[PDB]
Protein backbone atom coordinates (compact mmCIF):
# COMPACT_ATOMS: atom_id res chain seq x y z
CA UNK A 1 0.00 0.00 0.00
CA UNK A 2 1.33 3.42 -1.03
CA UNK A 3 0.32 7.07 -0.83
CA UNK A 4 0.24 9.87 -3.38
CA UNK A 5 -0.81 13.50 -3.50
CA UNK A 6 -3.90 14.51 -5.48
CA UNK A 7 -5.40 17.91 -6.31
CA UNK A 8 -9.14 18.55 -6.11
CA UNK A 9 -11.15 21.47 -7.47
CA UNK A 10 -14.55 22.61 -6.24
CA UNK A 11 -16.64 25.77 -6.07
CA UNK A 12 -11.53 26.20 -3.90
CA UNK A 13 -8.52 23.89 -4.28
CA UNK A 14 -7.06 21.23 -1.99
CA UNK A 15 -4.05 18.93 -2.34
CA UNK A 16 -4.22 15.93 0.00
CA UNK A 17 -2.21 12.75 0.49
CA UNK A 18 -4.44 9.86 -0.59
CA UNK A 19 -3.92 6.17 0.10
CA UNK A 20 -3.81 3.51 -2.60
CA UNK A 21 -6.79 1.91 -0.84
CA UNK A 22 -8.98 4.98 -0.32
CA UNK A 23 -12.29 4.76 -2.17
CA UNK A 24 -14.25 7.61 -3.73
CA UNK A 25 -16.63 7.63 -0.76
CA UNK A 26 -13.76 8.12 1.70
CA UNK A 27 -12.23 10.90 -0.42
CA UNK A 28 -15.56 12.73 -0.74
CA UNK A 29 -16.20 12.46 3.01
CA UNK A 30 -12.67 13.72 3.69
CA UNK A 31 -13.10 16.74 1.40
CA UNK A 32 -16.60 17.38 2.77
CA UNK A 33 -15.39 17.45 6.38
CA UNK A 34 -12.45 19.68 5.42
CA UNK A 35 -14.81 22.53 4.42
CA UNK A 36 -18.36 21.66 5.63
CA UNK A 37 -18.73 19.85 8.98
CA UNK A 38 -21.93 18.05 10.07
CA UNK A 39 -21.67 15.84 6.97
CA UNK A 40 -24.23 14.36 -0.88
CA UNK A 41 -21.28 14.98 -3.20
CA UNK A 42 -19.82 13.28 -6.27
CA UNK A 43 -16.34 13.13 -7.79
CA UNK A 44 -15.57 13.60 -11.48
CA UNK A 45 -12.41 13.28 -13.56
CA UNK A 46 -12.34 16.07 -16.14
CA UNK A 47 -10.34 16.11 -19.38
CA UNK A 48 -10.55 18.22 -22.51
CA UNK A 49 -11.97 15.09 -24.16
CA UNK A 50 -14.90 14.79 -21.76
CA UNK A 51 -16.14 14.26 -18.22
CA UNK A 52 -16.73 11.08 -16.25
CA UNK A 53 -18.05 10.18 -12.80
CA UNK A 54 -16.12 7.92 -10.43
CA UNK A 55 -17.86 5.00 -8.75
CA UNK A 56 -18.09 4.65 -4.97
CA UNK A 57 -15.75 1.65 -4.71
CA UNK A 58 -13.31 3.15 -7.24
CA UNK A 59 -9.86 4.29 -6.11
CA UNK A 60 -9.19 7.88 -7.27
CA UNK A 61 -5.43 7.53 -6.72
CA UNK A 62 -5.25 4.55 -9.10
CA UNK A 63 -7.53 6.39 -11.55
CA UNK A 64 -5.15 9.36 -11.48
CA UNK A 65 -2.01 7.41 -12.35
CA UNK A 66 -3.91 5.65 -15.17
CA UNK A 67 -3.75 8.87 -17.21
CA UNK A 68 -1.63 12.89 -22.83
CA UNK A 69 -4.25 13.65 -20.17
CA UNK A 70 -4.31 16.94 -18.26
CA UNK A 71 -7.14 15.51 -16.19
CA UNK A 72 -8.53 17.24 -13.14
CA UNK A 73 -10.67 15.81 -10.35
CA UNK A 74 -13.67 17.96 -9.42
CA UNK A 75 -15.96 17.72 -6.41
CA UNK A 76 -19.59 18.62 -7.14
CA UNK A 77 -22.95 18.82 -5.38
CA UNK A 78 -26.44 18.43 -6.79
CA UNK A 79 -27.54 21.18 -4.39
Amino acid sequence: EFHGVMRFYFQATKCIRVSSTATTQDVIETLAEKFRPDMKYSLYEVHVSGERRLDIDEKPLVVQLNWDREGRFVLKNEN
Partner: protein
Protein backbone atom coordinates in the same frame (compact mmCIF):
# COMPACT_ATOMS: atom_id res chain seq x y z
CA UNK B 1 -11.11 52.99 -6.06
CA UNK B 2 -10.57 49.98 -8.33
CA UNK B 3 -10.88 46.21 -8.14
CA UNK B 4 -7.61 44.51 -7.24
CA UNK B 5 -6.48 40.90 -6.82
CA UNK B 6 -3.97 39.84 -4.17
CA UNK B 7 -2.25 36.44 -4.02
CA UNK B 8 -1.47 35.70 -0.37
CA UNK B 9 0.71 32.73 0.58
CA UNK B 10 0.72 31.54 4.19
CA UNK B 11 4.16 30.29 5.17
CA UNK B 12 5.70 28.76 8.28
CA UNK B 13 6.61 25.62 10.18
CA UNK B 14 4.21 22.79 10.95
CA UNK B 15 1.62 22.98 13.70
CA UNK B 16 2.09 26.74 13.82
CA UNK B 17 -1.50 27.76 13.02
CA UNK B 18 -1.37 28.47 9.27
CA UNK B 19 -4.50 26.50 8.41
CA UNK B 20 -6.41 27.70 11.48
CA UNK B 21 -5.71 31.36 10.65
CA UNK B 22 -6.80 30.95 7.02
CA UNK B 23 -10.00 29.08 7.87
CA UNK B 24 -10.86 31.73 10.47
CA UNK B 25 -10.65 34.44 7.82
CA UNK B 26 -12.63 32.47 5.22
CA UNK B 27 -15.23 30.71 7.38
CA UNK B 28 -15.16 32.56 10.74
CA UNK B 29 -14.54 29.13 12.29
CA UNK B 30 -11.68 27.65 14.32
CA UNK B 31 -10.39 24.21 13.30
CA UNK B 32 -9.56 21.94 16.24
CA UNK B 33 -7.79 18.92 14.77
CA UNK B 34 -4.21 19.12 13.51
CA UNK B 35 -4.42 18.10 9.84
CA UNK B 36 -1.03 18.58 8.13
CA UNK B 37 -1.55 20.65 4.98
CA UNK B 38 0.03 20.07 1.59
CA UNK B 39 -1.37 22.93 -0.53
CA UNK B 40 -4.79 24.52 0.05
CA UNK B 41 -6.27 27.45 -1.89
CA UNK B 42 -9.06 29.87 -1.01
CA UNK B 43 -10.77 32.91 -2.53
CA UNK B 44 -12.57 35.66 -0.62
CA UNK B 45 -13.57 39.19 -1.59
CA UNK B 46 -13.26 41.89 1.09
CA UNK B 47 -13.04 45.67 1.42
CA UNK B 48 -9.71 47.05 2.66
CA UNK B 49 -9.11 50.81 2.87
CA UNK B 50 -12.20 51.54 0.82
CA UNK B 51 -11.56 49.18 -2.08
CA UNK B 52 -12.83 45.71 -2.94
CA UNK B 53 -9.95 43.24 -2.84
CA UNK B 54 -10.16 39.77 -4.39
CA UNK B 55 -7.91 37.77 -2.06
CA UNK B 56 -6.53 34.45 -3.33
CA UNK B 57 -5.09 32.72 -0.26
CA UNK B 58 -2.71 29.76 -0.53
CA UNK B 59 -2.19 27.81 2.69
CA UNK B 60 1.00 25.77 2.33
CA UNK B 61 2.77 22.88 4.03
CA UNK B 62 5.04 23.32 7.03
CA UNK B 63 6.40 19.77 7.08
CA UNK B 64 9.30 19.42 4.65
CA UNK B 65 8.10 15.95 3.61
CA UNK B 66 4.83 17.55 2.42
CA UNK B 67 6.40 20.61 0.74
CA UNK B 68 7.69 19.41 -2.63
CA UNK B 69 6.62 22.20 -5.01
CA UNK B 70 7.49 25.18 -2.85
CA UNK B 71 9.32 27.12 -5.57
CA UNK B 72 6.24 27.27 -7.81
CA UNK B 73 3.80 28.83 -5.34
CA UNK B 74 6.46 31.20 -4.01
CA UNK B 75 6.76 32.39 -7.61
CA UNK B 76 3.01 32.95 -7.98
CA UNK B 77 2.60 34.61 -4.58
CA UNK B 78 2.70 38.38 -4.20
CA UNK B 79 2.69 38.63 -0.41
CA UNK B 80 3.74 36.17 2.26
CA UNK B 81 2.28 35.64 5.73
CA UNK B 82 5.20 34.27 7.75
CA UNK B 83 3.57 32.63 10.77
CA UNK B 84 5.31 31.35 13.89
CA UNK B 85 3.90 30.19 17.23
CA UNK B 86 4.93 32.13 20.32
CA UNK B 87 5.11 28.89 22.34
CA UNK B 88 7.53 27.33 19.81
CA UNK B 89 10.97 28.92 19.56
CA UNK B 90 11.95 26.48 16.80
CA UNK B 91 9.21 27.74 14.47
CA UNK B 92 10.43 31.27 15.25
CA UNK B 93 13.97 30.42 14.13
CA UNK B 94 12.71 28.71 10.95
CA UNK B 95 11.25 32.07 9.86
CA UNK B 96 14.64 33.20 8.52
CA UNK B 97 14.89 30.03 6.43
CA UNK B 98 11.49 30.74 4.88
CA UNK B 99 12.53 34.40 4.49
CA UNK B 100 15.62 33.55 2.43
CA UNK B 101 13.83 31.02 0.22
CA UNK B 102 11.21 33.65 -0.65
CA UNK B 103 13.92 36.19 -1.47
CA UNK B 104 15.63 33.63 -3.71
CA UNK B 105 12.43 32.76 -5.59
CA UNK B 106 11.53 36.40 -6.24
CA UNK B 107 15.25 37.33 -6.48
CA UNK B 108 14.90 40.63 -4.62
CA UNK B 109 15.15 42.05 -1.12
CA UNK B 110 11.84 43.93 -1.53
CA UNK B 111 9.27 41.17 -0.99
CA UNK B 112 6.16 42.24 0.97
CA UNK B 113 5.79 40.16 4.12
CA UNK B 114 4.11 40.33 7.52
CA UNK B 115 5.52 38.50 10.54
CA UNK B 116 2.75 36.72 12.46
CA UNK B 117 3.03 35.29 15.96
CA UNK B 118 0.21 32.83 16.59
CA UNK B 119 -1.19 31.09 19.70
CA UNK B 120 -1.22 34.28 21.78
CA UNK B 121 -4.06 32.85 23.88
CA UNK B 122 -1.52 30.49 25.52
CA UNK B 123 0.35 31.51 28.66
CA UNK B 124 3.37 29.27 27.93
CA UNK B 125 5.15 31.93 25.90
CA UNK B 126 8.69 31.07 24.83
CA UNK B 127 9.12 33.94 22.33
CA UNK B 128 8.80 37.42 23.81
CA UNK B 129 7.08 40.19 21.85
CA UNK B 130 10.33 42.16 21.55
CA UNK B 131 12.22 39.23 20.00
CA UNK B 132 9.83 39.20 17.05
CA UNK B 133 9.85 43.01 16.86
CA UNK B 134 13.62 42.98 16.32
CA UNK B 135 13.30 40.37 13.57
CA UNK B 136 10.45 42.27 11.92
CA UNK B 137 12.24 45.63 12.07
CA UNK B 138 15.42 43.98 10.76
CA UNK B 139 13.36 42.77 7.79
CA UNK B 140 11.43 46.03 7.45
CA UNK B 141 8.02 44.36 7.82
CA UNK B 142 5.19 44.72 10.35
CA UNK B 143 4.68 42.25 13.18
CA UNK B 144 1.21 41.08 14.23
CA UNK B 145 0.29 38.94 17.24
CA UNK B 146 -2.65 36.72 16.30
CA UNK B 147 -4.84 34.04 17.85
CA UNK B 148 -6.71 31.71 15.51
CA UNK B 149 -8.61 30.31 18.51
CA UNK B 150 -10.26 33.67 19.32
CA UNK B 151 -9.90 35.50 15.95
CA UNK B 152 -7.49 38.00 17.55
CA UNK B 153 -5.57 39.92 14.89
CA UNK B 154 -6.63 37.51 12.13
CA UNK B 155 -8.23 40.27 10.05
CA UNK B 156 -5.42 42.70 10.92
CA UNK B 157 -2.73 40.21 9.84
CA UNK B 158 -4.24 39.58 6.40
CA UNK B 159 -5.33 43.19 5.81
CA UNK B 160 -1.88 44.48 6.80
CA UNK B 161 -0.35 42.07 4.29
CA UNK B 162 -2.60 43.51 1.56
CA UNK B 163 -1.41 47.00 2.50
CA UNK B 164 2.15 45.68 2.32
CA UNK B 165 1.53 44.28 -1.18
CA UNK B 166 0.19 47.63 -2.41
CA UNK B 167 3.59 49.17 -1.64
CA UNK B 168 5.12 47.20 -4.55
CA UNK B 169 2.04 46.91 -6.79
CA UNK B 170 2.83 48.18 -10.28
Amino acid sequence: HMMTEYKLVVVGAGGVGKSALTIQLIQNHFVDEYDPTIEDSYRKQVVIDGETCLLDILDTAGQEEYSAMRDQYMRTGEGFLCVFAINNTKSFEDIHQYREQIKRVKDSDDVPMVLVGNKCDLAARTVESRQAQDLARSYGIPYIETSAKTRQGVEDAFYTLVREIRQHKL
